[PDB]
Write a protein that binds this ligand. Structure first.
Ligand SMILES: C[C@@H]1O[C@@H](O[C@H]2[C@H](O[C@H]3[C@H](O)[C@@H](O)[C@H](O)O[C@@H]3CO)O[C@H](CO)[C@H](O)[C@@H]2O)[C@@H](O)[C@H](O)[C@@H]1O
Ligand SMILES: C[C@@H]1O[C@@H](O[C@H]2[C@H](O[C@H]3[C@H](O)[C@@H](O)[C@H](O)O[C@@H]3CO)O[C@H](CO)[C@H](O)[C@@H]2O)[C@@H](O)[C@H](O)[C@@H]1O
Ligand SMILES: C[C@@H]1O[C@@H](O[C@H]2[C@H](O[C@H]3[C@H](O)[C@@H](O)[C@H](O)O[C@@H]3CO)O[C@H](CO)[C@H](O)[C@@H]2O)[C@@H](O)[C@H](O)[C@@H]1O
Ligand SMILES: C[C@@H]1O[C@@H](O[C@H]2[C@H](O[C@H]3[C@H](O)[C@@H](O)[C@H](O)O[C@@H]3CO)O[C@H](CO)[C@H](O)[C@@H]2O)[C@@H](O)[C@H](O)[C@@H]1O
Ligand SMILES: C[C@@H]1O[C@@H](O[C@H]2[C@H](O[C@H]3[C@H](O)[C@@H](O)[C@H](O)O[C@@H]3CO)O[C@H](CO)[C@H](O)[C@@H]2O)[C@@H](O)[C@H](O)[C@@H]1O
Ligand SMILES: C[C@@H]1O[C@@H](O[C@H]2[C@H](O[C@H]3[C@H](O)[C@@H](O)[C@H](O)O[C@@H]3CO)O[C@H](CO)[C@H](O)[C@@H]2O)[C@@H](O)[C@H](O)[C@@H]1O
Ligand SMILES: [Cl-]
Ligand SMILES: [Cl-]
Ligand SMILES: [Cl-]
Lengths: 90, 90, 90
């Protein structure tokens, strides 16, 4: 078995984010044009997906983290990661 | 083992779609700015990926669903889900 | 167990790429509006993710391929696939 990743990118630079689900934990590596660095995102999960969009130069990222049948959305909206409205019945 | 997701988003709102492969079936949860709701997409699959693009304000989504070595593209083009041209030799 | 895919798309056509991790190897199927065809990308991996961005009409793709705890970035920047700066500590 391998680790599992999800990626997103924005802008002209570009900025890239790469999330890795590994042993029940999802972590983050970031590029803003000046070296890979380890980002603030650190939440539980066995599976991960991501999407992102820009509002002007401001980035909004949504990360879907899954453990068993439960998916939790994590929201970056410019200040920190907050838990999003997302619900499902899996 | 965990459920597996894939996500895409578009526009200023934004609209988001989140596909979940769970027990051989792929289902869909949608956001258009006014609550998560369960979308029309419901097709077989153990793995899922997605990409999407806008033609004006019209959304085109492509969902790649895999069972065993077979991938099937599903196409949203404004009216309903149709099976796309995609073929592979896995 | 199923094969595992990752998808990205760009432009008005659109062009689409679909990467499939199957039995330790990641391969690529491409659409540029005129039939699916098998692309140049062929590197080892059990898991795959992708993101892409346009600089004018030029496409930059980044493919994250994972085996065990090691992720390798592969870079398309208009000429061929090169191994990218990405590092992580998984
Ligand atoms: C998107 C966000 O990125 C990291 O957050 C750090 C933040 O990054 C800035 C970055 O310096 C800037 O060039 C980029 O274009 O936008 C980000 C802000 O949206 O910088 C702050 C301090 O200024 C902290 O270091 C943040 O942690 C990452 O850590 C977050 O998890 C998330 O991916
Ligand atoms: C896209 C959507 O985002 C959340 O929905 C909440 C919505 O999010 C605002 C957020 O407060 C703001 O920081 C950002 O600039 O824009 C978001 C909208 O794109 O805010 C509303 C009304 O205040 C509610 O709080 C929504 O729950 C997230 O919860 C959704 O699941 C979805 O990802
Ligand atoms: C993309 C498509 O979305 C759902 O389809 C439902 C459709 O959604 C509208 C939505 O109300 C609108 O705000 C959004 O911006 O575009 C969608 C149309 O492209 O609304 C119709 C009735 O008007 C039905 O409810 C559709 O089911 C989802 O169900 C589809 O699977 C797909 O994700
Ligand atoms: C992007 C491409 O989409 C399908 O290719 C078919 C192509 O799709 C049209 C579709 O009929 C139309 O509703 C939408 O507005 O635009 C699509 C092109 O982006 O149509 C052609 C010629 O009629 C063929 O029918 C193509 O098969 C899908 O089949 C491809 O695999 C790919 O996802
Ligand atoms: C993105 C790149 O695509 C394939 O590379 C082949 C390349 O494709 C062109 C394509 O014809 C053009 O319409 C598209 O818009 O841009 C691509 C160039 O960036 O064509 C060359 C010869 O001209 C070779 O056939 C390339 O292999 C794919 O093979 C690459 O792996 C990658 O996905
Ligand atoms: C986005 C970034 O791409 C690599 O970073 C290298 C950077 O890539 C250039 C590339 O040489 C060029 O062909 C393309 O047009 O633009 C890229 C930047 O977007 O080039 C710098 C300085 O020369 C370094 O060589 C960087 O390593 C990749 O290595 C990063 O991990 C990331 O994906
Ligand atoms: Cl670096
Ligand atoms: Cl809601
Ligand atoms: Cl074809």
């Amino acid at each position: 078995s391998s680790v599992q990743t999800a990626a997103t990118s924005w802008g002209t630079v570009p900025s890239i984010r790469v999330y890795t689900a590994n042993n029940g934990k999802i972590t983050e590596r970031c590029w803003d044009g000046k070296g890979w660095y380890t980002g603030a995102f650190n939440e539980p999960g066995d599976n991960v997906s991501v999407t992102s969009w820009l509002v002007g130069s401001a980035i909004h990222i949504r990360v879907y983290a899954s453990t068993g049948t439960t998916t939790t959305e994590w929201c970056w909206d410019g200040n920190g990661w907050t838990k999003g409205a997302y619900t499902a019945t899996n």
